[PDB]
DNA sequence: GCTGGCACGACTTTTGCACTATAATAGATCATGCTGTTGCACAT
């Protein structure tokens, strides 16, 4: 908040903590193989 | 006859060659890109 943020805002700096989008048919998949790296790896086919 | 600016034979000055243990000091963030090390995923 401020006005460390207009700056923040032009400079097109990333978020801490971004949300991920998805594509033109996001269907289930869940997770396929879920190891203890990131898991659920959403294949929507 | 008296005087005041010009040259000459020693002396004097200039110039290239030329080689030569102790200590000011540390109190911003903030972001970005690169490098090295480690852990996750696949293969015979």
Do not use: N, Q
């Not at 978020?15 to 594509?23: D, G, M, N, W």
């Not at 190891?35 to 294949?43: H, M, W």
């Amino acid at each position: 908040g401020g006005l460390p943020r207009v700056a923040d805002l032009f400079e097109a700096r990333r978020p801490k903590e971004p949300a991920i989008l998805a594509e033109i048919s996001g269907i289930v998949s869940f997770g396929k193989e879920t190891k203890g790296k990131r898991r659920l790896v959403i294949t929507p086919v």
